[PDB]
Amino acid sequence: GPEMVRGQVFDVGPRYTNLSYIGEGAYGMVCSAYDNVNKVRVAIKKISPFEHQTYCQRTLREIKILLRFRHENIIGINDIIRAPTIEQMKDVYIVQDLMETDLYKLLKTQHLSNDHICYFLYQILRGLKYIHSANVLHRDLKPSNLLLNTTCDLKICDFGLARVADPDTRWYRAPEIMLNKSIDIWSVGCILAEMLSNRPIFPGKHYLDQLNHILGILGSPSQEDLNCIINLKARNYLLSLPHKNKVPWNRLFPNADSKALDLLDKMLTFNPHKRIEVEQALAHPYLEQYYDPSDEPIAEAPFELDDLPKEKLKELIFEETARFQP
Numbered sequence: 001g002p003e004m005v006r007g008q009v010f011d012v013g014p015r016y017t018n019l020s021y022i023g024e025g026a027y028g029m030v031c032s033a034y035d036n037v038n039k040v041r042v043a044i045k046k047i048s049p050f051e052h053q054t055y056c057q058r059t060l061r062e063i064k065i066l067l068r069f070r071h072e073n074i075i076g077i078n079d080i081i082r083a084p085t086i087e088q089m090k091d092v093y094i095v096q097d098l099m100e101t102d103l104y105k106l107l108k109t110q111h112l113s114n115d116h117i118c119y120f121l122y123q124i125l126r127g128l129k130y131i132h133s134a135n136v137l138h139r140d141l142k143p144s145n146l147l148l149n150t151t152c153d154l155k156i157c158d159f160g161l162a163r164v165a166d167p168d169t170r171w172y173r174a175p176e177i178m179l180n181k182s183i184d185i186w187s188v189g190c191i192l193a194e195m196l197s198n199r200p201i202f203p204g205k206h207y208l209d210q211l212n213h214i215l216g217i218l219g220s221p222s223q224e225d226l227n228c229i230i231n232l233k234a235r236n237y238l239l240s241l242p243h244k245n246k247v248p249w250n251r252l253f254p255n256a257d258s259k260a261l262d263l264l265d266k267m268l269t270f271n272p273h274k275r276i277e278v279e280q281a282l283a284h285p286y287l288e289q290y291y292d293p294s295d296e297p298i299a300e301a302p303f304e305l306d307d308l309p310k311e312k313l314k315e316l317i318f319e320e321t322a323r324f325q326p
C-alpha cells in the first residue's frame with residue numbers, strides 16, 4: 001500500500017506521492033514529494049523519536065518553534081502526518097518547503113563571490129533578527145542548516161536544540177560554551193569565515209583543540225575579557241596557556257573585502273558582552289546595500305522548560321500535531 005524510499009515506509013499518501021530520497025541522518029530521512037491537494041512540490045522527513053527522551057525533546061522543539069514562527073528566511077512546517085491514536089504513533093512525517101540544497105553542499109562545489117557572500121549573510125542575520133526577537137536561540141547555526149533555492153533565497157532550519165534565552169557541531173561553538181543569544185552571532189561569524197575561505201576557520205578535533213584554534217587566530221584574551229568570565233576553574237585553565245599573538249584578519253583572508261573582515265571581527269570577539277548583536281550586525285556597512293528595517297520583521301509573540309519523561313513528551317508531541325487531523 002504505502003510508498004517506500006530506500007527500504008523505509010513513507011506512509012504519507014494518498015495526499016503526498018512521487019517520493020524521492022534527498023538525504024538522511026540521525027533524525028530520519030528527508031524526501032521530495034508532490035502535494036496532490038495544493039498541487040506543489042514539498043519536502044517530507046520521517047522522524048522516529050519515541051524511544052529516547054532527548055529525541056522527543058528535539059522533535060517537540062522543532063515542531064513547537066517552527067509552527068509558531070512565520071518568516072521569509074526560516075523554513076516553516078506546512079503539514080504534519082502521524083497515526084490517529086497516541087498508542088500507534090511510532091513515526092511523525094513533517095512536510096516543509098522544498099529547496100535546491102544547503103550551504104554545506106554549495107561550498108564543497110563552488111568558491112562564492114562577495115556578491116553571493118554579502119546576500120547570504122544579509123538573509124542569515126535577517127532570519128536571526130526574527131528568531132532573537134522571539135527570545136529564542138537556534139544554538140546550532142552552521143552551513144548544513146542553511147537551505148537554498150535556485151533563486152539564491154536562504155532559509156534557516158533545525159530548531160531541535162532551540163531554547164528561550166535565560167542567562168540563569170564544534171567548529172561553530174562559541175568559546176564561552178567550552179568554559180561557562182550572542183552564541184548565535186559567533187556561529188554566524190564562523191559561517192561568514194567559511195564562506196570567505198571555503199574552509200572551516202576553527203576546525204577543532206576536541207573541545208580543548210577547538211579553543212587552541214580560536215585563540216590561535218584571536219591570540220590570548222585581554223584583561224577585561226578574562227574578568228567578564230566569572231568561572232575561576234575555567235579562567236584558571238586559560239591563564240595556564242602559553243601567550244599567542246592575534247593574527248590580523250587580512251593575513252588569513254588576503255583577497256577578502258575590507259568591510260566584511262570588519263564585521264567578522266565584531267562577530268568573532270572573545271568577550272560575549274562586547275560582541276555585536278544581530279540588530280547592529282544588520283546595520284553594519286557591509287550590508288548597507290541590503291539593510292531595510294521596514295522589510296526586517298520581528299516575532300509578534302515572544303515566548304518553557306521541558307526535561308520530562310518521554311511519555312509526557314509523546315503526549316505534548318501528539319497534542320501539538322493534533323491540529324493536522326480530522
Ligand SMILES: COC[C@@]1(C(=O)Nc2ccc3[nH]nc(-c4ccnc(C5CC5)c4)c3c2)CCN(CC(=O)N2CC=C(c3ccc(-c4ncccn4)cc3)CC2)C1
Binds near residue numbers: 056157
Ligand atoms: C540539517 O537539516 C536537516 C533537517 C532539516 O530540517 N532538513 C530539511 C528540512 C526541510 C527541507 N526542505 N528542503 C530540504 C532539502 C532539499 C534539497 N536538498 C537539501 C540538501 C541536500 C541536503 C535539503 C530540506 C531539508 C532534518 C530534520 N531537522 C530538524 C528536525 O527534524 N528535528 C530536530 C531533530 C530531531 C531528531 C534527531 C535525531 C533523532 C534520533 N536520533 C537517533 C536515533 C533515533 N532518533 C530523532 C529526532 C527531530 C526534529 C533538520
